mmCIF file of C-alpha atoms and ligand atoms in Angstrom:
data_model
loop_
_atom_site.group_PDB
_atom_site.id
_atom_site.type_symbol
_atom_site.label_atom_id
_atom_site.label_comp_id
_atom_site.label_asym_id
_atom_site.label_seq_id
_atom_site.Cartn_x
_atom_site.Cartn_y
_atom_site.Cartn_z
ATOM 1 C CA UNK A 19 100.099 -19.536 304.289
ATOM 2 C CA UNK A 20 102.880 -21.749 303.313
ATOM 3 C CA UNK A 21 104.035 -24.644 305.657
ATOM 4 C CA UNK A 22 107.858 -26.088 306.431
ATOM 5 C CA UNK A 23 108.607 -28.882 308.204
ATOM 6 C CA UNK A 24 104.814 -28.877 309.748
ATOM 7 C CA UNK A 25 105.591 -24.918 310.712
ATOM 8 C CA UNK A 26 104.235 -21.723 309.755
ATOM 9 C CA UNK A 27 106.876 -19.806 307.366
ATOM 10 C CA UNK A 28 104.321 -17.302 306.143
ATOM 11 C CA UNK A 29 106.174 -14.967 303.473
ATOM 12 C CA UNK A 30 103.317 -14.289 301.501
ATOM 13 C CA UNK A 31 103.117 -14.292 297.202
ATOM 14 C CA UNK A 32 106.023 -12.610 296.778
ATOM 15 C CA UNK A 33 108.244 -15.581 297.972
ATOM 16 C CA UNK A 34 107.622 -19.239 296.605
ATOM 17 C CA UNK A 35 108.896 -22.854 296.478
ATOM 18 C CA UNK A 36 110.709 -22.752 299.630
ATOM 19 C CA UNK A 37 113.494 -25.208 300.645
ATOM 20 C CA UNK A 38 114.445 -26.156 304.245
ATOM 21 C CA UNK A 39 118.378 -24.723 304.555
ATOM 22 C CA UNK A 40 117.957 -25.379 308.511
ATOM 23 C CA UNK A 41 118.420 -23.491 311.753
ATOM 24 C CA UNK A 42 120.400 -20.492 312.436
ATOM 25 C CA UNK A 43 120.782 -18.282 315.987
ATOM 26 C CA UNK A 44 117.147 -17.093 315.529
ATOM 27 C CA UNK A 45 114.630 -19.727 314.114
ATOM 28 C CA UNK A 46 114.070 -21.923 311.030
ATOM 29 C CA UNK A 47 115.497 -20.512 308.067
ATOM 30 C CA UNK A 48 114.277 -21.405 304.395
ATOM 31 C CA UNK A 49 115.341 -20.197 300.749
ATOM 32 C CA UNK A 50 112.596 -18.730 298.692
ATOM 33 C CA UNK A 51 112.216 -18.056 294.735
ATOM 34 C CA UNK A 52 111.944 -14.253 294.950
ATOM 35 C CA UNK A 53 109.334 -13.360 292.221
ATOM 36 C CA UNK A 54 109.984 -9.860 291.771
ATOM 37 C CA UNK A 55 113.984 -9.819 291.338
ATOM 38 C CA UNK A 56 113.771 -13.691 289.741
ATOM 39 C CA UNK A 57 116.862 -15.006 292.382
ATOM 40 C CA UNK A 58 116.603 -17.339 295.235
ATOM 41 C CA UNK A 59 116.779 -15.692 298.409
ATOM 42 C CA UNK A 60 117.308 -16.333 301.946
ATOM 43 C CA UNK A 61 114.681 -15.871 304.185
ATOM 44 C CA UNK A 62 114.789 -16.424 308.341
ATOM 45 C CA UNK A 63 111.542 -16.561 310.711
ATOM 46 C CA UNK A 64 111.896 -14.468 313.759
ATOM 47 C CA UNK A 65 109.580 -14.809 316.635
ATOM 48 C CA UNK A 72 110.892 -9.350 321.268
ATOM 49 C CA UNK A 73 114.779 -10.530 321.945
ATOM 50 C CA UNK A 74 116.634 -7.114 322.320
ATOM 51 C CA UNK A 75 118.950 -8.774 320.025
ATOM 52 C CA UNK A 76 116.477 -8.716 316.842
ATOM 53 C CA UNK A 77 115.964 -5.153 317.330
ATOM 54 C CA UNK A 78 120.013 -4.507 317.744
ATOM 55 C CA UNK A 79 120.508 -6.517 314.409
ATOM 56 C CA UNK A 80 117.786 -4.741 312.058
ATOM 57 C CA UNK A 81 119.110 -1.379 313.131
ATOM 58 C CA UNK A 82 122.344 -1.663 312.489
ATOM 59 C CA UNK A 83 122.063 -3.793 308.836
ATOM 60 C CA UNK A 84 119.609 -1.101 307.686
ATOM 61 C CA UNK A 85 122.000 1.738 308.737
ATOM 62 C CA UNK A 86 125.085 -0.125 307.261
ATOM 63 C CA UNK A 87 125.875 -0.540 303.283
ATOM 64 C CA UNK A 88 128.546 -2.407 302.350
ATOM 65 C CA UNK A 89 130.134 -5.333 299.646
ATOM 66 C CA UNK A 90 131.081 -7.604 302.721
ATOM 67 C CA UNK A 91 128.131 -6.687 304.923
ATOM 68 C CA UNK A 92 125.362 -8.814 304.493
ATOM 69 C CA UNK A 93 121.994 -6.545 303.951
ATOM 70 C CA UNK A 94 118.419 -6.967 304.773
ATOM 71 C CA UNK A 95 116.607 -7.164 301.202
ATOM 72 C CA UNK A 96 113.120 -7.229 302.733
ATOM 73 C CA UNK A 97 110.981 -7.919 305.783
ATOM 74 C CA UNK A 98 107.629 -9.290 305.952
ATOM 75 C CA UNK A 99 105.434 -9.193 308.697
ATOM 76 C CA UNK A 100 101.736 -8.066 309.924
ATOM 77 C CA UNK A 101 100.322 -4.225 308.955
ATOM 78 C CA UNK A 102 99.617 -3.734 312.767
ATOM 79 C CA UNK A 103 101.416 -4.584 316.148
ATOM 80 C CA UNK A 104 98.110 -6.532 317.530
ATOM 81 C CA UNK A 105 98.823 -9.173 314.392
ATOM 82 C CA UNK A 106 102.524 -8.951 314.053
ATOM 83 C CA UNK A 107 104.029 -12.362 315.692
ATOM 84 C CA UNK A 108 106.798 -13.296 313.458
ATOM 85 C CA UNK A 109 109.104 -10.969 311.568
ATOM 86 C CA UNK A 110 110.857 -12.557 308.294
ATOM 87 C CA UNK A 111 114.384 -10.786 307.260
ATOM 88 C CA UNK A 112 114.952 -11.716 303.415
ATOM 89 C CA UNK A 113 118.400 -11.121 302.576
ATOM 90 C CA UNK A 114 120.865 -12.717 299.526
ATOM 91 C CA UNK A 115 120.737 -16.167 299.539
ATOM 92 C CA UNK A 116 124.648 -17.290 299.595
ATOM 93 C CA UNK A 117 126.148 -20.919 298.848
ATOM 94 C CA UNK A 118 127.624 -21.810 302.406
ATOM 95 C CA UNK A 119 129.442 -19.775 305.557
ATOM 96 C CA UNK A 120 133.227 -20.196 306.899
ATOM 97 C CA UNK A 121 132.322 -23.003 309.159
ATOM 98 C CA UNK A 122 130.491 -25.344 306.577
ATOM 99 C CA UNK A 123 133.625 -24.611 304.180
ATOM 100 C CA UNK A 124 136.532 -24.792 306.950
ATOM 101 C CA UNK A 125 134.729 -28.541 307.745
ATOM 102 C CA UNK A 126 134.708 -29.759 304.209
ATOM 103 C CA UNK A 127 137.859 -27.864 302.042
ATOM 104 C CA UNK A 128 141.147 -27.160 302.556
ATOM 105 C CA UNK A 129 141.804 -23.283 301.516
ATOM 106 C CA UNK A 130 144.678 -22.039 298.970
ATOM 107 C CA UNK A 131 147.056 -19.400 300.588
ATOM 108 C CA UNK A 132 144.797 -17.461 298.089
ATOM 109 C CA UNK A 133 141.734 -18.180 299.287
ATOM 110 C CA UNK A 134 143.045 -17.701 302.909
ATOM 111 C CA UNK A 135 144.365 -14.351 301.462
ATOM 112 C CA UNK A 136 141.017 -13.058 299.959
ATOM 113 C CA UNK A 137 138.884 -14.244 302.568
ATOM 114 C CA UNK A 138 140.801 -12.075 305.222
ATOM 115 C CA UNK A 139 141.234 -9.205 303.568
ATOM 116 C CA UNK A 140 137.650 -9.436 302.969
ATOM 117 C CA UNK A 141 136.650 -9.859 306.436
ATOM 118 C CA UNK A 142 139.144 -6.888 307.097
ATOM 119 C CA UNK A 143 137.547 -4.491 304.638
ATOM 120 C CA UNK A 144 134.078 -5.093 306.265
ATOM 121 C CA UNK A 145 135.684 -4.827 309.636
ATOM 122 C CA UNK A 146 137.030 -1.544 308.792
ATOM 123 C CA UNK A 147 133.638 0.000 307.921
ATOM 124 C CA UNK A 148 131.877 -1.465 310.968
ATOM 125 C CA UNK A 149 134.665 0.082 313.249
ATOM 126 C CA UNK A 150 134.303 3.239 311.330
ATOM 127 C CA UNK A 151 130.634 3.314 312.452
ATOM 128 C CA UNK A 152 132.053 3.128 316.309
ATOM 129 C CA UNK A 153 130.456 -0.896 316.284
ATOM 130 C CA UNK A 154 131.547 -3.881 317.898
ATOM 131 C CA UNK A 155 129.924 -7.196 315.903
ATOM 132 C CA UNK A 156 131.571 -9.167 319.068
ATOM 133 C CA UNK A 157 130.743 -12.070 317.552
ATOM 134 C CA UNK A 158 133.165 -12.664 314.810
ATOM 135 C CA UNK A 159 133.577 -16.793 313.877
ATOM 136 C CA UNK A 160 133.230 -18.961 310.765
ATOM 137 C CA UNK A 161 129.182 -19.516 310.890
ATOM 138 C CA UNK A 162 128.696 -15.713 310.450
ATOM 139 C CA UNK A 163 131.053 -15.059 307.792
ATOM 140 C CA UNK A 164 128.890 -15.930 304.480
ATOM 141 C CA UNK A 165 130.294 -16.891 301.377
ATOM 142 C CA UNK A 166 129.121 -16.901 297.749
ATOM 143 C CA UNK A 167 129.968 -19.353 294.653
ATOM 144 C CA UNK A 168 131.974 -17.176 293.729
ATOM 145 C CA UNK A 169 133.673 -16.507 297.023
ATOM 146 C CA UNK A 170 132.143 -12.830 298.282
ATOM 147 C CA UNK A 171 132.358 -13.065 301.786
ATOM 148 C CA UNK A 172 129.422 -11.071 304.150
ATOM 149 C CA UNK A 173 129.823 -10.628 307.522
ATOM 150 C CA UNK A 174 126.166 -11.283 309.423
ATOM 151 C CA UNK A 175 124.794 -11.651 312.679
ATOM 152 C CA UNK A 176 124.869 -8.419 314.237
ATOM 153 C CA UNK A 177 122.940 -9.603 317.418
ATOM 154 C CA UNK A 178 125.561 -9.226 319.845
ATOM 155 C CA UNK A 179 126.895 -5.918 318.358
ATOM 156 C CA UNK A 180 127.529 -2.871 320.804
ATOM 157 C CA UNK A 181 128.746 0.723 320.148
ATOM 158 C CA UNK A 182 132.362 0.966 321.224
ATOM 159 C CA UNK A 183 132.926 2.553 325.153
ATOM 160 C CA UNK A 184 136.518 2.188 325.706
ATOM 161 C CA UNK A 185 136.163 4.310 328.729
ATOM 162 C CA UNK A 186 133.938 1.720 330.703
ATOM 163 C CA UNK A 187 135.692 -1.202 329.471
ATOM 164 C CA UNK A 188 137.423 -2.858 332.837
ATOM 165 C CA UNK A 189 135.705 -5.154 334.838
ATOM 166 C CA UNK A 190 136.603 -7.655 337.402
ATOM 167 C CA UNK A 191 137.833 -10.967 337.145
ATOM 168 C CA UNK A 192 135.925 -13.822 335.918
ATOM 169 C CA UNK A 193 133.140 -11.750 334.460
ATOM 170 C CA UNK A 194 130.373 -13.578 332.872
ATOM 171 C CA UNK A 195 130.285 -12.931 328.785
ATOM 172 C CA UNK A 196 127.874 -13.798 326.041
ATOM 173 C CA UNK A 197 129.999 -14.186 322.491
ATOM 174 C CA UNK A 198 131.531 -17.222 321.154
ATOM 175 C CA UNK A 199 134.041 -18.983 323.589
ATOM 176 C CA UNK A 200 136.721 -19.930 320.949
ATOM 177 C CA UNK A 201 136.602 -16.760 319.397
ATOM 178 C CA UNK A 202 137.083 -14.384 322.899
ATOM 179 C CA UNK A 203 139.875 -12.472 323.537
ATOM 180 C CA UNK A 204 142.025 -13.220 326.642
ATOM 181 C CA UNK A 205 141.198 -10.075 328.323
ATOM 182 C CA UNK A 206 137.415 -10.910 328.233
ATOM 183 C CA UNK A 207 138.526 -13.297 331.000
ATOM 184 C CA UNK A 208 140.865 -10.848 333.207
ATOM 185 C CA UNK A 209 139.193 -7.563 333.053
ATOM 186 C CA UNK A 210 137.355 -6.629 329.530
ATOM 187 C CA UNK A 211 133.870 -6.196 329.196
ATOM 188 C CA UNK A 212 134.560 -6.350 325.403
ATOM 189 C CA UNK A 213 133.844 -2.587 324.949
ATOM 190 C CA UNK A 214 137.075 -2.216 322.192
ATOM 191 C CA UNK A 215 137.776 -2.397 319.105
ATOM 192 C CA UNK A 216 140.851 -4.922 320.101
ATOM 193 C CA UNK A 217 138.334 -7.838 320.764
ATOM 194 C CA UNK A 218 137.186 -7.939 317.299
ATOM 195 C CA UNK A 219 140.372 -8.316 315.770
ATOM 196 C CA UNK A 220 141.444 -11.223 318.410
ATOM 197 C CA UNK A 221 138.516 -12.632 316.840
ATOM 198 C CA UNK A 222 139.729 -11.985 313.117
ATOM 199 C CA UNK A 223 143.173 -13.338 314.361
ATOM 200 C CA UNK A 224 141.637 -16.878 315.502
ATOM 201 C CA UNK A 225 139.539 -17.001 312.331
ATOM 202 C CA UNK A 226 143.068 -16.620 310.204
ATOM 203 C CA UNK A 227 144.774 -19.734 312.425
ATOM 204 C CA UNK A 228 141.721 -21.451 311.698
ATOM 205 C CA UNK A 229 141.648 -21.188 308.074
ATOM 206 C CA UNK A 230 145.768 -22.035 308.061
ATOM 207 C CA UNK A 231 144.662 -25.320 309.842
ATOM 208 C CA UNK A 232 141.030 -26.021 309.439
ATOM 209 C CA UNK A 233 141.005 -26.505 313.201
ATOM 210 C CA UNK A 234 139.959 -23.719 315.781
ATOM 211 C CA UNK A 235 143.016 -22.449 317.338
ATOM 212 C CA UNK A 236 141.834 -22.364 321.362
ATOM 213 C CA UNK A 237 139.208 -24.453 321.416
ATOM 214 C CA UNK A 238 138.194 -24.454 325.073
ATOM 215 C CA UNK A 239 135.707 -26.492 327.264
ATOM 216 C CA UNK A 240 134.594 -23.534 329.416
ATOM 217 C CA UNK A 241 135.352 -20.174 330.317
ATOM 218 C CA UNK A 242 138.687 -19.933 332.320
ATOM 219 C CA UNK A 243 139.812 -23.146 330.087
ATOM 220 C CA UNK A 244 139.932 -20.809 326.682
ATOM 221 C CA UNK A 245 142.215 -18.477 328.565
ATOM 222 C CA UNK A 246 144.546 -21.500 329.510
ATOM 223 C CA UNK A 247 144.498 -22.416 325.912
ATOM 224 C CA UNK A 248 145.232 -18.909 324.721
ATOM 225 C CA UNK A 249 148.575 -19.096 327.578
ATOM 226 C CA UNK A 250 149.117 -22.949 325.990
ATOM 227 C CA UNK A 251 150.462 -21.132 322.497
ATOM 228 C CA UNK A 252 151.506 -17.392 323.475
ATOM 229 C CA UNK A 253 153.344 -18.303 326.374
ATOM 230 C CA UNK A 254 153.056 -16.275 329.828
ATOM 231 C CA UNK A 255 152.587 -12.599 329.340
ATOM 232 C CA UNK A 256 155.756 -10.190 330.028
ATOM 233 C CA UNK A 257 156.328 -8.207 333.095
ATOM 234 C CA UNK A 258 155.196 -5.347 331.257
ATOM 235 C CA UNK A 259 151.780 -6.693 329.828
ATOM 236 C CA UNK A 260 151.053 -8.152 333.275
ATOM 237 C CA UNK A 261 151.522 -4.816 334.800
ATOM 238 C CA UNK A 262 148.831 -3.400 332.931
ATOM 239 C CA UNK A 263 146.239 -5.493 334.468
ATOM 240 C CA UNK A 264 145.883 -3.459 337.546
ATOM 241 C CA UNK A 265 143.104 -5.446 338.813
ATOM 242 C CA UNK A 266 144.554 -7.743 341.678
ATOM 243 C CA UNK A 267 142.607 -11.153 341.214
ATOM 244 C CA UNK A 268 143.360 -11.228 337.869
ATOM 245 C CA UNK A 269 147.175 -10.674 337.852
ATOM 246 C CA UNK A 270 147.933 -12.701 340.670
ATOM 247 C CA UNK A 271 145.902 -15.056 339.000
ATOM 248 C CA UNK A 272 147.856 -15.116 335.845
ATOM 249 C CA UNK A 273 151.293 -15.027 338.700
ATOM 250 C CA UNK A 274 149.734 -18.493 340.000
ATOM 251 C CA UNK A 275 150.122 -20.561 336.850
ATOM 252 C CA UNK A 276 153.765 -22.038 336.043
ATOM 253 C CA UNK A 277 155.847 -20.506 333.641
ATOM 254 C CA UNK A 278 155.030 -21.486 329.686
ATOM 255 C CA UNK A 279 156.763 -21.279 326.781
ATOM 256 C CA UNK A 280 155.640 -19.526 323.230
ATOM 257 C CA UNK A 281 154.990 -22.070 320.391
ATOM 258 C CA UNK A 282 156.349 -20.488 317.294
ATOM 259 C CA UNK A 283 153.805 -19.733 314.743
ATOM 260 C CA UNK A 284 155.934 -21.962 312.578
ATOM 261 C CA UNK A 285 155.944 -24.741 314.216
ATOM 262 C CA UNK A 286 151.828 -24.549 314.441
ATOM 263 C CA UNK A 287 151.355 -23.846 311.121
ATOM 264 C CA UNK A 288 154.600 -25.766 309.032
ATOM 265 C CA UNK A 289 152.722 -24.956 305.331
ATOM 266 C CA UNK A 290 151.634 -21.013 306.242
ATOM 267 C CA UNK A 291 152.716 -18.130 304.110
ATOM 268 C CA UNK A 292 155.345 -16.517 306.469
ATOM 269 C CA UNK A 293 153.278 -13.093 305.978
ATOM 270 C CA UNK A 294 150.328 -14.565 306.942
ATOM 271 C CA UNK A 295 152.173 -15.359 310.060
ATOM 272 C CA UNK A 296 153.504 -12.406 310.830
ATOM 273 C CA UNK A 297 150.103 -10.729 310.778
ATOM 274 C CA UNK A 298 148.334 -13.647 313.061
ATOM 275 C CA UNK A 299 150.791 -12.644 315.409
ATOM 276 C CA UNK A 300 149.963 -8.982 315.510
ATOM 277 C CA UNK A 301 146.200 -9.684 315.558
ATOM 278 C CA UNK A 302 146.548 -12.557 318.221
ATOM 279 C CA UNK A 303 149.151 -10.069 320.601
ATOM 280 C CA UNK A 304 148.032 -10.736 324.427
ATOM 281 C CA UNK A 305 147.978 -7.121 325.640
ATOM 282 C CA UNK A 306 144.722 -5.340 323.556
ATOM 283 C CA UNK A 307 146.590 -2.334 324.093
ATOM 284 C CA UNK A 308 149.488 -3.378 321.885
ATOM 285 C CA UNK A 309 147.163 -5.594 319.321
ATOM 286 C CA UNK A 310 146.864 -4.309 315.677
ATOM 287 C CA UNK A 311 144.044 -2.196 314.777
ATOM 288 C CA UNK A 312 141.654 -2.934 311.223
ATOM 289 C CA UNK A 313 143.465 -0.436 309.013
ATOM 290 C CA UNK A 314 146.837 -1.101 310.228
ATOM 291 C CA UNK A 315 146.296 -4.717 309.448
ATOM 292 C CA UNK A 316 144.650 -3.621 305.989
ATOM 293 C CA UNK A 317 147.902 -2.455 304.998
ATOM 294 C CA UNK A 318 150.091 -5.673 306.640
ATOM 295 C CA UNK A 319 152.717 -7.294 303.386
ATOM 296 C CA UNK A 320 150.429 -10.283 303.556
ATOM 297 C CA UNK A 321 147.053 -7.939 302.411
ATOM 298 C CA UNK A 322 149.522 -6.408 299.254
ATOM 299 C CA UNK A 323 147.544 -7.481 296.421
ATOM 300 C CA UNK A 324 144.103 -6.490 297.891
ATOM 301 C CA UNK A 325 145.017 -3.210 299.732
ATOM 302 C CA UNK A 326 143.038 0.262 298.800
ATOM 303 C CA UNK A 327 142.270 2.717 301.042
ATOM 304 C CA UNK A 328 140.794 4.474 298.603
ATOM 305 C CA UNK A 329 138.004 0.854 297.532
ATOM 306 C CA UNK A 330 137.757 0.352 301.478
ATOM 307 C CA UNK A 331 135.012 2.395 302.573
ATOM 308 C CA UNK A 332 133.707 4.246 305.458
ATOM 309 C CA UNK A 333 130.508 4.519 307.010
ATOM 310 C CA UNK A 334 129.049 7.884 306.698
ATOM 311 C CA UNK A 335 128.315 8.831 309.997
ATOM 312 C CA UNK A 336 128.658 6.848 314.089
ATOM 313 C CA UNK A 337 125.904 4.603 314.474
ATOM 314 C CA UNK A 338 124.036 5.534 317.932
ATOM 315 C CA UNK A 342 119.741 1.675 325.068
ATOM 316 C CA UNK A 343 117.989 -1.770 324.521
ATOM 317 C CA UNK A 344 118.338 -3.790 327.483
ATOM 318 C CA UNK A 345 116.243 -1.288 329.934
ATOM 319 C CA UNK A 346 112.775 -1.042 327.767
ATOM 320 C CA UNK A 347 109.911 -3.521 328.780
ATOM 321 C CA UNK A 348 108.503 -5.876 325.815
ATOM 322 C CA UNK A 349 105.353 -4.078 324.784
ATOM 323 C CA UNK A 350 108.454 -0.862 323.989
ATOM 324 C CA UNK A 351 110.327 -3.381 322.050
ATOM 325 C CA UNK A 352 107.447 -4.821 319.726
ATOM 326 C CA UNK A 353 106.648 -1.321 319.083
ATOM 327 C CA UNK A 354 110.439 -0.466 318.213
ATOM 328 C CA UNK A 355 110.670 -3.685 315.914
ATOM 329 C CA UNK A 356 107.295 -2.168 314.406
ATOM 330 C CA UNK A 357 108.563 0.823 313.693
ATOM 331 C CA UNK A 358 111.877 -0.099 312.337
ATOM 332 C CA UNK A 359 110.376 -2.428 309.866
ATOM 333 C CA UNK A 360 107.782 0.209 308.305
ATOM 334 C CA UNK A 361 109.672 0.751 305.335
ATOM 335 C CA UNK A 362 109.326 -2.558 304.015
ATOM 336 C CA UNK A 363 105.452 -2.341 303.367
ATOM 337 C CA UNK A 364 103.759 -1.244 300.530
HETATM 338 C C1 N29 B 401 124.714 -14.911 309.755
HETATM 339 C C2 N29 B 401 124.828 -16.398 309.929
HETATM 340 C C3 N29 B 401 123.776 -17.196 309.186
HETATM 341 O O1 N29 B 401 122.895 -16.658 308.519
HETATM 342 N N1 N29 B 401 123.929 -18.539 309.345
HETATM 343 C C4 N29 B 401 123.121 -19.641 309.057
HETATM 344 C C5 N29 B 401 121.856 -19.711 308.462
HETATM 345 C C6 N29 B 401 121.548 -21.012 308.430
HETATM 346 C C7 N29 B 401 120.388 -21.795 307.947
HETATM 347 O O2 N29 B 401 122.556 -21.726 308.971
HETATM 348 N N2 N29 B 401 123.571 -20.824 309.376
HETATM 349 C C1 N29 B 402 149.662 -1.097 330.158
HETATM 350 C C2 N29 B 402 150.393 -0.178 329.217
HETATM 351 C C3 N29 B 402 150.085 -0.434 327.760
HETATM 352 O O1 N29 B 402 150.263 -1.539 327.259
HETATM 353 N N1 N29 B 402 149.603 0.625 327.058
HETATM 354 C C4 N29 B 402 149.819 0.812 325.690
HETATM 355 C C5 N29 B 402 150.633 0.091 324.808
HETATM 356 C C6 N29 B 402 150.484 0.674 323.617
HETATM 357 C C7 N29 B 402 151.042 0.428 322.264
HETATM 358 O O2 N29 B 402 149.625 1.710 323.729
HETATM 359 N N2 N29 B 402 149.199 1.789 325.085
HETATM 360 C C1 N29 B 403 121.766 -15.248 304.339
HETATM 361 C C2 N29 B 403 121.851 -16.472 304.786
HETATM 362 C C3 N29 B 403 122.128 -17.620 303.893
HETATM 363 O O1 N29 B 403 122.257 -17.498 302.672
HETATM 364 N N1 N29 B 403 122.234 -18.837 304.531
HETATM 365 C C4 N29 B 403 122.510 -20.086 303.965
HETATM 366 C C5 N29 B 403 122.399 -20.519 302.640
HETATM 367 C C6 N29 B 403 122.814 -21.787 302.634
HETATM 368 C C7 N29 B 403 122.941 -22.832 301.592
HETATM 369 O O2 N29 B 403 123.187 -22.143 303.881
HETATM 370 N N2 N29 B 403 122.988 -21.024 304.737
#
């Protein structure tokens, strides 16, 4: 079995001469001269986590331009030998984060890139999924600039009706990227917290910088407040849970920054949209299609060219390991000869 970096990375004949490309959220992660379809590929050791399981599901279930999809896996023909699981999947030139770091993006890039997110969005909401984990490092991007949505490890079906929670509840997705009511009272159940995400992702790419870039969790909320200004009357009386308005009632008094005045060189459509994706109440926040069809997306938007999934995609959490080998198993069958 081949070797990396004085580790097993066992993926057999089929995939050769592999190169180090580093670490991702799950293990090391290699590219690999696919014999059979003559292309580099990308190729990531696993080695369950609830959140392997969660992520094979749904990218088998889902097929789409701006998904990413699982090509292959490779592991052992029985549970008793199967340690680590290898997902094969295109092998793409660099992700949002690696490009936002290095390059500053045209108005057109900025354009494409959103829309593209947006059309992928579209078909994972259709599906009644959350990714939940939107941000630069899991938005691929080809040499051509194809952008893929991955990481589907934090995903959840939507459940708007068991969405509230108390104030101050622990959460597991990206600080920067988390929507302010994640802080108040959202267990991130909604639609709404995916396109927060989408709307810090756009400020990001206007300025190469991450919008609210807080230290810890009640610090992102204060850096949220630091650019949209104290909620209204009206969105504060929405939040009927006590600690959390009286909380917000506690701070002094802030003052909006104008888009503008953030963003000086920004398409004034562009704008216009951030500010409906990045709108405090979730309630009153734009949803994927509506945004689809915002001035800025003109040139791009097609209902007809953005699809749908076929069917809702229907837990994980309550089944001991032995039950969640097995499951990984058995979802991987197909991929043997
Ligand atoms: C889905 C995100 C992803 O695949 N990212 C990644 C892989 C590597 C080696 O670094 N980042
Ligand atoms: C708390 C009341 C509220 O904001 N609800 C709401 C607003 C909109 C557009 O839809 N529901
Ligand atoms: C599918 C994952 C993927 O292609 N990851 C890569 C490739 C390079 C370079 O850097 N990350």
């Amino acid at each position: 079995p081949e070797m990396v970096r004085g580790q097993v990375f066992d993926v057999g004949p089929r995939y050769t001469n592999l190169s180090y490309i580093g670490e991702g959220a799950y293990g090391m992660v290699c590219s690999a001269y696919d014999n059979v379809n003559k292309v580099r590929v990308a190729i990531k050791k696993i080695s369950y986590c609830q959140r392997t399981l969660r992520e094979i599901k749904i990218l088998l279930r889902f097929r789409h331009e701006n998904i990413i999809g699982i090509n292959d896996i490779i592991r052992a023909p029985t549970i008793e030998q199967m340690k680590d699981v290898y997902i094969v999947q295109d092998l793409m030139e660099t992700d949002l984060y690696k490009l936002l770091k290095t390059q500053h993006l045209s108005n057109d890039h900025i354009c494409y890139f959103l829309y593209q997110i947006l059309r992928g969005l579209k078909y994972i909401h259709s599906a009644n999924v959350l990714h939940r984990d939107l941000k630069p490092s899991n938005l691929l991007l080809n040499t051509t600039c194809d952008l893929k949505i991955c990481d589907f490890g934090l995903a959840r079906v939507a459940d708007p009706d068991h969405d509230h929670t108390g104030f101050l509840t622990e959460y597991v997705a990206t600080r920067w990227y988390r929507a302010p009511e994640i802080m108040l009272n959202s267990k991130g159940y909604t639609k709404s917290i995916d396109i927060w995400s989408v709307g810090c992702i756009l400020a990001e790419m206007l300025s190469n910088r991450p919008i609210f870039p807080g230290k810890h969790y009640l610090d992102q909320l204060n850096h949220i407040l630091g650019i949209l200004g104290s909620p209204s009357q009206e969105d504060l009386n929405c939040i009927i849970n006590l600690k959390a308005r009286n909380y917000l009632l506690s701070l002094p008094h802030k003052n909006k920054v104008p888009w503008n005045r953030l963003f000086p060189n920004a398409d004034s459509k562009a704008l216009d949209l951030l500010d409906k994706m990045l709108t405090f109440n979730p309630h009153k926040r734009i949803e994927v299609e509506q945004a689809l069809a915002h001035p800025y997306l003109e040139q791009y938007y097609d209902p007809s060219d953005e699809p749908i999934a076929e069917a809702p995609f229907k837990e994980l959490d309550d089944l001991p390991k032995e039950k969640l080998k097995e499951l990984i198993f058995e979802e991987t069958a197909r991929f043997q000869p």
